Nucleic acid binder design. Structure first.
Ligand SMILES: [Mg+2]
Ligand SMILES: [Mg+2]
Ligand SMILES: [Mg+2]
Ligand SMILES: [Mg+2]
Ligand SMILES: [Mg+2]
Ligand SMILES: [Mg+2]
Ligand SMILES: [Mg+2]
Ligand SMILES: [Mg+2]
Ligand SMILES: [Mg+2]
Ligand SMILES: [Mg+2]
Ligand SMILES: [Mg+2]
Ligand SMILES: [Mg+2]
Ligand SMILES: [Mg+2]
Ligand SMILES: [Mg+2]
Ligand SMILES: [Mg+2]
Ligand SMILES: [Mg+2]
Ligand SMILES: [Mg+2]
Ligand SMILES: [Mg+2]
Ligand SMILES: [Mg+2]
Ligand SMILES: [Mg+2]
Ligand SMILES: [Mg+2]
Ligand SMILES: [Mg+2]
Ligand SMILES: [Mg+2]
Ligand SMILES: [Mg+2]
Ligand SMILES: [Mg+2]
Ligand SMILES: [Mg+2]
Ligand SMILES: [Mg+2]
Ligand SMILES: [Mg+2]
Ligand SMILES: [Mg+2]
Ligand SMILES: [Mg+2]
Ligand SMILES: [Mg+2]
Ligand SMILES: [Mg+2]
Ligand SMILES: [Mg+2]
Ligand SMILES: [Mg+2]
Ligand SMILES: [Mg+2]
Ligand SMILES: [Mg+2]
Ligand SMILES: [Mg+2]
Ligand SMILES: [Zn+2]
Lengths: 155, 206, 144, 24, 60, 120, 78
RNA sequence: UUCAUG
RNA sequence: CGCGGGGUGGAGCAGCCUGGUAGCUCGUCGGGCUCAUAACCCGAAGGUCGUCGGUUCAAAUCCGGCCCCCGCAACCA
RNA sequence: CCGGGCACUCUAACGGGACUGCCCGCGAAAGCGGGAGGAAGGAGGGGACGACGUCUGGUCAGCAUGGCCCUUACGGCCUGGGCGACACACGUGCUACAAUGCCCACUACAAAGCGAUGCCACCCGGCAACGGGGAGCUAAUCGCAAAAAGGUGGGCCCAGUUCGGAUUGGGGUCUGCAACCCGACCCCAUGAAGCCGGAAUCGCUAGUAAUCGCGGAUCAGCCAUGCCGCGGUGAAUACG
């Protein structure tokens, strides 16, 4: 949008947890209008969580989102001559989107073959610190903060 | 690629269908054939009387062919015999009881299908074109109407480049549904081509 | 030996609907000049006369080895088509309002010259100029 | 998929009926 | 060739597959409607004039 | 255990393992396993040899297959290239035959696009 | 297709049955390509019509359950 | 901030 | 007239190592860009490796020798 | 399904309702930021609507039409062919390239529609397309009709595969005088390319994208994956 503020679509609260992070994760899992299969995948994923680790069905996921949550992310700005790749800090209302989208991409590329166990082995390794999603976070926080030299463009 | 037809834009509201009858899929095409052929008889052969519209109805085998004429003196006849022969003509192409009700207009300049025909008669009578336009709008305003606009399309004045001339006095609110802008269109079939006279007459609103 | 030639103004004048690689029957010597580049199509097309095509009005120089064996240089040379194509174009001249103009005279692997004919429509790019003020106002004074 | 003519969804996409998509 | 074909649409003493319907006001052989019998163009210019009952500019 | 020709499947379900035999597809493999009488979902790494030959006696003796079938398909093609029927011609130059457009498509009967074309 | 008809013509059938009268000539110029090769009535070369001219297909026993229009190919560039 | 012509 | 030097893609050239492993730029064809041509970007493809005869398992590679092209000489009288 | 009956959902008319209407902050006023109530908010969301005119835009091949041209042919009728050809290139789409996926079974859940020479329920026969009877419907009453995706629990097990369904052969059913050029389906073989795509590029700001089916038009059949509509599930993001 260009004119107005373009306020965000208010989500739903989830059913079994009553949380708002989990519904955005349902949405990022959801492929081609299939939410009844996507949230099904997530609840099988927390079932695999309760099977493997003696933790809450939500705590490992929320801590995975926090431990994949970026702060400094790099955005391109053409400033004449060579388009610089300026770092900037991120609003948490975009950090949540970047975090959940990275979780879904790394979980779908993750070399397990079944739906909810990919997310299981991804949320375990992201809450630990050794997953593909937190690898991508460290990748972008090493693109920025080493690309800090052009940070004087706040735009 | 603009300006949709201001009868059919109104048509649901503020304006009647000019032919109103009914039947389903069985006899709609078959009614429409005779409903077009009656008009092809009339509009070709009643033009001297200057017919505006042919309101065609049928409840059950009672074809009301009520026409709207400025001067019924050559669509009725002296005491009435052209009406008789025209009803025996209307019996020839549909066998039904073709009750032909000629009905005169209340001012023959507030009716756009006859103002546009009058401009077409002027063009085919080789008159001055924009003089005819700025005269026809002025005759409409002296008859008394809220606003007029006579668009006359190309090949105008015997030329080769084909510009479109037009003139207005008053307001012609086309985009307003409640406006009741009557609309008339008439070809002009002179030597230098087809001059397409249009005329909008903004009657009383609402 | 000559490269592809050019019907310059006809390429830049007539709309080429489709082409034919026609043929020319040279009437005895008008060869080396067309093999060296002496050809100018200006004021020429390919016209039928009731049975067959002649490339009309094409100027080619008589060759200077023929000190007195020269040829009338701008003539109508006997063009070559197929027979169904020939009567096809013979019909199409009266069907669509065409003009049959050459595009080039290019040579093939038999070492022969073929005149690449092509159809016309006119490609009417000529601007009929809009009326100046001193005629529009006297037309308006007529309109007064 | 759907361009196949010998399944359920491949027959429901073509619309018709068969051994693979029967009539009740 | 359309004054031939607007009567060839009338006459059929041959096979009954060649009874393609042709338009009524004009002579178009495409988009002729199994309703009215006008083609799409004659349908548009009659629905805008108001010579078809019940028809109306649609918006749903 | 090989079935027909030499075509041996292993470690797969039998009712699509029969499909690797040419001339048997999914439908015949559904049919002529329970037709002889075999549970059609027994993995052929464990198929009883008496059931293998009770299957093979229906595979070979009933319908024609790889070789005697394949060769009749090819003989049908060579018979179609006879004097010039329209389906044997265009087998003769590989174009398609049952109503395929070929203006842009037909890359599975033609090739490898030989892109030698183009105007100026 | 077409299991409820012999789908042969009222003039090609008459001509081949009349030309099978104890053996006869060979010329039969058809226009209707749609008719089949008349089964057990093979042998006489038929001039089928692809539009440009009549191609004279000599009909054989390997071509019996086909149509006559397969042997009048309608285009160039095989 | 680049970049030639109809 | 005698030496020595080349011949390699449409053209200009790398080359090719005792011989087996062939390419580079532009040009080309197709696309992408563009209102359209340039330019640029992406996919490939193209060569009897001067003919010929030679030893070789095998030649573009090495040995001759012949035709075009280049660079040299052709001096003392 | 009725016996009692219309409560409702609905249907389609007629009405109301939403206007800055209220109140506060800012503001010269217009109006803006917010709140409350309301079902709804600040054009409530979509349609139809597209000015003076430009592109000498497109259509003489929808029609009308000035002009020129054909008038035993450029007109007219028919048979057959072509409009479908194919070395390639392009545009728009469709399916794909799978395990969130595919196959079989079973049970749900729509609106929009459309039908007397039509829709065909329900039987019988044929695996099936369809075929032979024949119910109902002049259609909120009968039919197309199955909805699909979903869900259920059984299979497949990361495999060019139970992915894919192009191709080619065979057996056929319907329409139609006629399926060879060139129809649609059915069935059985066939099982290829294709393992997410170059440089570039497009679509989308809310029931939208995406995915899923359904209907209609023209129509004998049909080229339909197109178009026009209908609903099912239903996102991410818009810092700027
Ligand atoms: Mg720079
Ligand atoms: Mg956000
Ligand atoms: Mg005159
Ligand atoms: Mg030149
Ligand atoms: Mg000039
Ligand atoms: Mg001029
Ligand atoms: Mg001047
Ligand atoms: Mg499959
Ligand atoms: Mg059911
Ligand atoms: Mg038809
Ligand atoms: Mg075809
Ligand atoms: Mg630069
Ligand atoms: Mg520059
Ligand atoms: Mg220049
Ligand atoms: Mg200029
Ligand atoms: Mg090379
Ligand atoms: Mg060279
Ligand atoms: Mg290029
Ligand atoms: Mg000296
Ligand atoms: Mg609103
Ligand atoms: Mg133009
Ligand atoms: Mg004309
Ligand atoms: Mg035209
Ligand atoms: Mg006409
Ligand atoms: Mg004719
Ligand atoms: Mg076409
Ligand atoms: Mg596509
Ligand atoms: Mg599937
Ligand atoms: Mg319908
Ligand atoms: Mg029956
Ligand atoms: Mg109904
Ligand atoms: Mg209903
Ligand atoms: Mg097949
Ligand atoms: Mg892709
Ligand atoms: Mg790029
Ligand atoms: Mg539909
Ligand atoms: Mg189509
Ligand atoms: Zn029409």
């Amino acid at each position: 949008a260009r004119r107005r503020r373009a306020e965000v679509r208010q989500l739903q609260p989830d059913l079994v947890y009553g949380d708002v992070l989990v519904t955005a994760f349902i949405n990022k899992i959801m492929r081609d209008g299939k939410k009844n299969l996507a949230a099904r995948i997530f609840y099988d994923a927390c079932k695999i969580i309760q099977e493997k680790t003696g933790q809450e069905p939500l705590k490992v996921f929320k801590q995975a989102v926090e431990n994949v949550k970026p702060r400094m992310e790099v955005r391109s700005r053409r400033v004449g001559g060579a388009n610089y790749q300026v770092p900037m800090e991120v609003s948490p209302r975009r950090q949540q989107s970047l975090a959940l989208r990275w979780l879904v991409q790394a979980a779908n590329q993750r070399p397990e073959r079944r739906a909810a166990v990919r997310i299981a082995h991804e949320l375990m390794d992201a809450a630990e610190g050794k997953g593909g999603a937190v690898k991508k976070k460290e990748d972008v926080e090493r693109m920025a903060e080493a690309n800090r030299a052009y940070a004087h463009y706040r735009w | 690629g603009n300006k949709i037809h201001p009868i059919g834009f109104r048509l649901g509201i503020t304006r009647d269908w000019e032919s109103r009858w009914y039947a389903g899929k069985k006899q709609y095409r078959h009614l429409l054939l005779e409903d077009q052929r009656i008009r092809g008889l009339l509009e070709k052969e009643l033009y001297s009387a200057g017919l505006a519209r042919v309101d065609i109805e049928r409840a059950a085998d009672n074809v009301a062919v009520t026409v709207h004429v400025a001067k019924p003196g050559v669509v009725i006849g002296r005491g009435g015999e052209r009406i008789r022969v025209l009803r025996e003509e209307l019996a020839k192409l549909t066998g039904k009881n073709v009750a032909l009700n000629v009905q005169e207009v209340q001012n023959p300049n507030l009716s756009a299908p006859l103002v546009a025909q009058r401009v077409a008669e002027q063009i085919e009578r080789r008159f001055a074109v924009r003089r005819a336009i700025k005269q026809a709008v002025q005759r409409v305003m002296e008859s008394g109407a809220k606003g007029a606009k006579v668009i006359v399309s190309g090949r105008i004045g015997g030329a080769e480049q084909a510009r479109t001339e037009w003139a207005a006095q008053g307001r012609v609110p086309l985009h307003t549904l409640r406006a009741n802008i009557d609309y008339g269109f008439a070809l002009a079939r002179t030597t230098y081509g087809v001059l397409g006279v249009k005329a909008y007459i903004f009657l009383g609103e609402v | 030996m000559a490269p592809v030639l050019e019907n310059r103004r006809a390429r830049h004048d007539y709309e080429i609907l489709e082409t034919y690689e026609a043929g020319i029957a040279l009437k005895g010597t008008e060869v080396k000049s067309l093999r060296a580049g002496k050809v100018d199509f200006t004021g020429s097309f390919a016209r039928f006369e009731d049975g067959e095509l002649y490339l009309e009005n094409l100027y080619i120089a008589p060759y200077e080895k023929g000190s007195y064996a020269n040829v009338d240089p701008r003539r109508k040379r006997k063009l070559l088509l197929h027979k169904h194509e020939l009567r096809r174009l013979l019909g199409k001249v009266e069907q669509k309002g065409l003009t049959l103009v050459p595009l080039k005279i290019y040579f093939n692997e038999r070492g022969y010259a073929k005149v690449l004919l092509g159809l016309a429509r006119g490609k009417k790019a000529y601007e009929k100029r809009r009326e100046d003020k001193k005629e529009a106002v006297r037309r308006a004074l007529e309109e007064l | 998929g759907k361009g196949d003519r010998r399944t359920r969804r491949g027959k429901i996409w073509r619309g018709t009926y068969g051994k693979y998509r029967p009539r009740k | 060739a359309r004054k031939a074909l607007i009567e060839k649409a009338k006459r059929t003493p041959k096979f009954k597959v060649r009874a393609y319907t042709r338009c009524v006001r004009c002579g178009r052989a495409r988009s002729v409607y199994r309703f009215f019998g006008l083609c799409r163009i004659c349908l548009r210019e009659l629905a805008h004039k108001g010579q078809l009952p019940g028809v109306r500019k649609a918006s749903w | 255990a090989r079935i027909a020709g030499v075509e041996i499947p292993r470690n797969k379900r039998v009712d699509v393992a029969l499909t690797y035999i040419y001339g048997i597809g999914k439908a015949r493999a559904k049919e002529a396993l329970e037709k002889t009488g075999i549970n059609p979902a027994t993995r052929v790494k464990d198929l009883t040899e008496a059931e293998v030959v009770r299957l093979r006696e229906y595979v070979e003796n009933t319908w024609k297959l790889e070789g005697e079938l394949r060769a009749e398909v090819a003989a049908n093609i060579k018979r179609l290239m006879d004097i010039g029927c329209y389906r044997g011609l265009r087998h003769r130059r590989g174009l398609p035959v049952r109503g395929q457009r070929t203006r842009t498509n037909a890359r599975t009967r033609k090739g490898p696009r030989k892109t030698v074309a183009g105007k100026k | 297709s077409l299991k409820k008809g012999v789908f042969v013509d009222d003039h090609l059938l008459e001509k081949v049955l009349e030309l099978n009268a104890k053996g006869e000539k060979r010329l039969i110029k058809t226009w209707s390509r749609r008719s089949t090769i008349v089964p057990e009535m093979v042998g006489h070369t038929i001039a089928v019509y692809n539009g440009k001219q009549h191609v004279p297909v000599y009909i054989t026993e390997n071509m019996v359950g086909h149509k006559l229009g397969e042997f009048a190919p309608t285009r160039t560039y095989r």
